[PDB]
Amino acid sequence: QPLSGAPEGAEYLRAVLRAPVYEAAQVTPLQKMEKLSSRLDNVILVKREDRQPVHSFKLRGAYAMMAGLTEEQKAHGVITASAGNHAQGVAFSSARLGVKALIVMPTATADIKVDAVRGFGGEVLLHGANFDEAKAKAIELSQQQGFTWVPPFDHPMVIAGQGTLALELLQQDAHLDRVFVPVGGGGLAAGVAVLIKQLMPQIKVIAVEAEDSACLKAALDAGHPVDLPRVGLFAEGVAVKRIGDETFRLCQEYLDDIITVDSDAICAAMKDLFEDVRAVAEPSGALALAGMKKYIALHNIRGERLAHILSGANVNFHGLRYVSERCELGEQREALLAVTIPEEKGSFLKFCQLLGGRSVTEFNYRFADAKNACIFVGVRLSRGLEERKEILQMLNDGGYSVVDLSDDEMAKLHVRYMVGGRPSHPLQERLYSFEFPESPGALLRFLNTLGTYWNISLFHYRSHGTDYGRVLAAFEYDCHDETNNPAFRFFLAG
Amino acid sequence: QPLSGAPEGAEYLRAVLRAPVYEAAQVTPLQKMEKLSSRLDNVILVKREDRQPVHSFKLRGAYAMMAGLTEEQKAHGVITASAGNHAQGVAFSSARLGVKALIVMPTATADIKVDAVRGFGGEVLLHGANFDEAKAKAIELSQQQGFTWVPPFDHPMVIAGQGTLALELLQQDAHLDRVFVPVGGGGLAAGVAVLIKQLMPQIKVIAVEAEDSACLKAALDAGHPVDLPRVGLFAEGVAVKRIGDETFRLCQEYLDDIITVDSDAICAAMKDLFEDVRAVAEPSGALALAGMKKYIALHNIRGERLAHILSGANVNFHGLRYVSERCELGEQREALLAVTIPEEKGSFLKFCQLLGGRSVTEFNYRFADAKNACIFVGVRLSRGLEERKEILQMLNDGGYSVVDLSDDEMAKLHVRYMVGGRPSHPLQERLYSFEFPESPGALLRFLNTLGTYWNISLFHYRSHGTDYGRVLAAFEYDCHDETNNPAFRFFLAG
Ligand SMILES: *Cc1c(COP(=O)(O)O)cnc(C)c1O
Numbered sequence: 001q002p003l004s005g006a007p008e009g010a011e012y013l014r015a016v017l018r019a020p021v022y023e024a025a026q027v028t029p030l031q032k033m034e035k036l037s038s039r040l041d042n043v044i045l046v047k048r049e050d051r052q053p054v055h056s057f058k059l060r061g062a063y064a065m066m067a068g069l070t071e072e073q074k075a076h077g078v079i080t081a082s083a084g085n086h087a088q089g090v091a092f093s094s095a096r097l098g099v100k101a102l103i104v105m106p107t108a109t110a111d112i113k114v115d116a117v118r119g120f121g122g123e124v125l126l127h128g129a130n131f132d133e134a135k136a137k138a139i140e141l142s143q144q145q146g147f148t149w150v151p152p153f154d155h156p157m158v159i160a161g162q163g164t165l166a167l168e169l170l171q172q173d174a175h176l177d178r179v180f181v182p183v184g185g186g187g188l189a190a191g192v193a194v195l196i197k198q199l200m201p202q203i204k205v206i207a208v209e210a211e212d213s214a215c216l217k218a219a220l221d222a223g224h225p226v227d228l229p230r231v232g233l234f235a236e237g238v239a240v241k242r243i244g245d246e247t248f249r250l251c252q253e254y255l256d257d258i259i260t261v262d263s264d265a266i267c268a269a270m271k272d273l274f275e276d277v278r279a280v281a282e283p284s285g286a287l288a289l290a291g292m293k294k295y296i297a298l299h300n301i302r303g304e305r306l307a308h309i310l311s312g313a314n315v316n317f318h319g320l321r322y323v324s325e326r327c328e329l330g331e332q333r334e335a336l337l338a339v340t341i342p343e344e345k346g347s348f349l350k351f352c353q354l355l356g357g358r359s360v361t362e363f364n365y366r367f368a369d370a371k372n373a374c375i376f377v378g379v380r381l382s383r384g385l386e387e388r389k390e391i392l393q394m395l396n397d398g399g400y401s402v403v404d405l406s407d408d409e410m411a412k413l414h415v416r417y418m419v420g421g422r423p424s425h426p427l428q429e430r431l432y433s434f435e436f437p438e439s440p441g442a443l444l445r446f447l448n449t450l451g452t453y454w455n456i457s458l459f460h461y462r463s464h465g466t467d468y469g470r471v472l473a474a475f476e477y478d479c480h481d482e483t484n485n486p487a488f489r490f491f492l493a494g
Numbered sequence: 495q496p497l498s499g500a501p502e503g504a505e506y507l508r509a510v511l512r513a514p515v516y517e518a519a520q521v522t523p524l525q526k527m528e529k530l531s532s533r534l535d536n537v538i539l540v541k542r543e544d545r546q547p548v549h550s551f552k553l554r555g556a557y558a559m560m561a562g563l564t565e566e567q568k569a570h571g572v573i574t575a576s577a578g579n580h581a582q583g584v585a586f587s588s589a590r591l592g593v594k595a596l597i598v599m600p601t602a603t604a605d606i607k608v609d610a611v612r613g614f615g616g617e618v619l620l621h622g623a624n625f626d627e628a629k630a631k632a633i634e635l636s637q638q639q640g641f642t643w644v645p646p647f648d649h650p651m652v653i654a655g656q657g658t659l660a661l662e663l664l665q666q667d668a669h670l671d672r673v674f675v676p677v678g679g680g681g682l683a684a685g686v687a688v689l690i691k692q693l694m695p696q697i698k699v700i701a702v703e704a705e706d707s708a709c710l711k712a713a714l715d716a717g718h719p720v721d722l723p724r725v726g727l728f729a730e731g732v733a734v735k736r737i738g739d740e741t742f743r744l745c746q747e748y749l750d751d752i753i754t755v756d757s758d759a760i761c762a763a764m765k766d767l768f769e770d771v772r773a774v775a776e777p778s779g780a781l782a783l784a785g786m787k788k789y790i791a792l793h794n795i796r797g798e799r800l801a802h803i804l805s806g807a808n809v810n811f812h813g814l815r816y817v818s819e820r821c822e823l824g825e826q827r828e829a830l831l832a833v834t835i836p837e838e839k840g841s842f843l844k845f846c847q848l849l850g851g852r853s854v855t856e857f858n859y860r861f862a863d864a865k866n867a868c869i870f871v872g873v874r875l876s877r878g879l880e881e882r883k884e885i886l887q888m889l890n891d892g893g894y895s896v897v898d899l900s901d902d903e904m905a906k907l908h909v910r911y912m913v914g915g916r917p918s919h920p921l922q923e924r925l926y927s928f929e930f931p932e933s934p935g936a937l938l939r940f941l942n943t944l945g946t947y948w949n950i951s952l953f954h955y956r957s958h959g960t961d962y963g964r965v966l967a968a969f970e971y972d973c974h975d976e977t978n979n980p981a982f983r984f985f986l987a988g
């Protein structure tokens with residue numbers, strides 16, 4: 001309990017030091033990013049918060065708040081919240097303190113999230129449609145059954161428990177220059193600032209928020225918790241509409257700066273974490289790095305010791321896909337080509353023969369009658385632009401190609417999933433499916449072996465890292481006759 | 495050195511106990527899988543080997559072998575290998591012992607893998623084309639410069655160092671029933687068996703190999719290290735042609751059984767690790783779980799305490815994509831529909847209006863003239879088959895749909911990347927790109943807002959979890975005129 005007002009600097013310190021976090025939570029490693037740090041020119045360190053048993057930090061504050069309630073036998077009474085990632089923190093906590101918790105969530109949440117909570121401990125009650133709706137209940141039941149509302153953020157105790165991290169940080173590397181903090185409701189940044197600010201003033205504390213969830217920046221600018229019209233939903237755990245409150249706006253008087261960023265950045269930040277530390281972030285968990293990356297360049301900060309927080313790690317395996325897909329876009333990984341090859345009766349072979357070694361990502365074609373049936377080709381590069389530059393020229397010895405891959409947002413994002421369709425007039429073709437161990441030039445072989453005496457009307461191929469069914473081809477190494485195939489009919493045939 | 499023969503049971507034990515592994519390596523957590531264990535009905539535990547500083551286990555054996563060489567001042571002399579995941583182990587080791595190491599790799603390896611090694615420590619020499627070619631050199635240089643060849647597996651010392659794990663295992667949970675071990679060259683299984691077999695005989699030790707890299711099963715069957723014609727390349731670290739040797743075939747006289755499995759399984763096993771432990775495997779690192787899963791059912795093993803090894807974790811972020819993509823196939827996640835909607839002048843709206851709440855993954859269409867332009871629709875499900883069963887019937891109140899999603903390997907794997915093409919005859923259309931915050935029914939809104947008075951000729955949409963550019967539409971919320979767009983021309987236009 002002991003905080004529900006306007007704690008003063010020190011009071012927070014005290015609360016921080018006195019908070020029983022470790023009974024449930026753990027000090028989290030603070031490791032350095034070797035690739036990135038070396039890339040940019042500073043020491044970059046990450047606060048491995050995903051290593052708590054609830055994979056995020058929330059555990060701290062719920063534990064602190066909840067564990068210092070019981071001084072009032074009001075556990076006997078009870079507790080309740082409404083959520084997805086913090087409902088976890090409470091769950092985990094309720095169980096440890098043997099205090100019954102109730103978690104209210106929307107009605108159509110997701111088995112997965114409902115079981116985690118149920119898992120940790122906690123009883124859920126699925127009641128809502130909207131979130132606000134779930135929370136109206138929670139809050140109801142409070143009042144009626146007397147459960148104790150447990151804030152995801154707006155709370156001195158909750159805040160004090162998060163500072164806990166700061167406390168660790170400073171003891172893990174006191175030669176820190178700047179620290180980057182994610183901003184959802186503001187718990188975490190709030191608890192991190194006060195601390196550091198008390199202990200080591202010279203430490204810079206930058207909040208970092210979602211371009212699309214910029215609760216803070218916005219309230220800042222009005223100097224007023226302000227409701228947001230819309231809130232992005234990538235960075236789930238950061239999707240807050242109106243920042244914290246008092247405690248938050250209040251406390252953000254220790255904040256040194258603020259910075260927003262876009263989903264696309266987050267998606268990179270995720271790539272980064274993974275690649276160096278082999279850590280798996282969750283949008284908001286990567287959010288703060290991204291910011292850094294941003295700040296680094298902005299201010300041309302070279303030479304410092306900076307650290308950010310791997311806030312959490314609750315993400316769907318399949319969510320991973322999207323990410324990649326997005327970074328790929330931002331990267332210069334492949335070549336995307338509109339290569340027109342003259343033939344119909346002859347082959348693609350010749351054309352291939354000069355990409356025999358190079359890695360084929362896509363090679364999609366559909367009969368079309370224009371003396372020159374065009375081909376959507378994709379080639380996995382290494383040397384980026386320079387290597388493409390080759391392919392290109394090289395290919396300049398015959399058919400004429402077009403470099404649809406550079407900035408062709410259209411190809412890169414839609415058309416490379418659209419090449420096909422229908423021919424023109426009915427066709428006496430046959431459909432077949434082929435599969436073959438992927439290698440660096442397996443295709444060729446396939447093609448070579450396939451022969452050159454075919455009136456191939458259709459070709460489809462996506463490859464290393466995205467599909468195991470290898471090829472679908474239509475004429476006029478493993479085979480399956482897929483002729484009158486339903487899909488084909490309805491969309492390709494015609 | 496002390497092992498280059500036919501170590502006898504105990505000798506291994508000794509070597510195991512005497513091996514200096516911890517100077518470089520760490521005891522690895524052995525945690526239980528709560529979801530899965532509860533799913534299947536046994537206690538399933540994973541040997542978190544990805545937690546070594548080289549993210550795999552290799553560190554053990556290279557360290558053991560290498561650290562007990564120096565008793566011969568032949569470090570002064572030197573060491574060399576040829577690789578990707580084990581070249582790492584040696585690197586890391588060479589540096590710690592301050593013994594110069596040289597790593598030979600093919601000529602066109604991959605910056606990434608070359609830098610890791612360089613990272614850890616070690617000097618690489620990129621010389622090859624083929625792998626065998628890189629190793630011919632390594633072996634050369636030995637002979638000439640006197641470097642000491644360090645086996646990835648064929649070696650009593652190397653083997654003894656891997657047993658180290660076993661040693662841990664048994665001390666981490668002695669109530670184990672069965673243990674599953676991945677099989678590349680056979681180091682790890684070899685070192686794991688001997689141990690356990692010495693210490694606790696009643697422990698079952700199943701190797702688990704790649705359907706496509708079944709080195710062992712094969713040699714077993716002939717009773718003869720046998721060269722494999724082909725070797726899969728998913729499970730990189732398990733891609734061995736002819737099992738170990740003596741040490742391996744020899745030692746596999748302590749093995750209780752063996753079992754293979756397919757890439758597709760591995761891809762699930764990867765999903766699993768991630769979802770419960772939030773660990774990120776690498777094909778071979780998941781290989782062994784998959785096996786389990788297999789064995790579990792085979793033998794209807796209920797009630798046991800079984801554990802497997804998270805062998806390693808070196809994987810490309812982008813590699814992740816493929817995986818998902820594969821599990822999705824094996825799952826029953828979405829609905830794939832050939833829904834024919836009658837209109838041309840009117841709309842898709844009406845059709846939509848009854849999926850307004852349900853989640854849209856794809857909604858792709860191209861003008862075609864048939865009184866009824868057909869639509870490739872995709873819908874994210876929850877209740878699996880049952881829920882689809884609905885959509886279906888529900889949709890039975892109007893246009894007639896076809897359920898191309900069930901077992902339609904064709905749609906699920908090729909066509910859902912092929913719907914489009916060209917129309918029939920030239921078209922006086924205009925292309926536009928739209929983007930809009932994704933939600934549960936944002937589309938609708940888009941559509942509704944888009945209006946109903948449009949002679950829309952083209953539509954393309956892939957969604958939550960795979961693309962941020964939302965829509966591409968062609969007529970006769972953010973907009974961009976993308977009309978004479980190059981890609982479009984060449985492949986859609988026509
Ligand atoms: C909950 C959470 C946040 C931010 O929380 P606040 O205390 O409201 O700022 C950020 N990242 C992750 C992963 C989170 O779970």
Ligand SMILES: *Cc1c(COP(=O)(O)O)cnc(C)c1O
Pocket residue numbers: 550551552579580646647676677678679680681682683731732776778779805806807
């Ligand atoms: C090297 C390795 C293996 C198997 O090695 P062996 O000792 O040859 O059996 C398996 N999984 C991973 C991740 C590996 O790196």
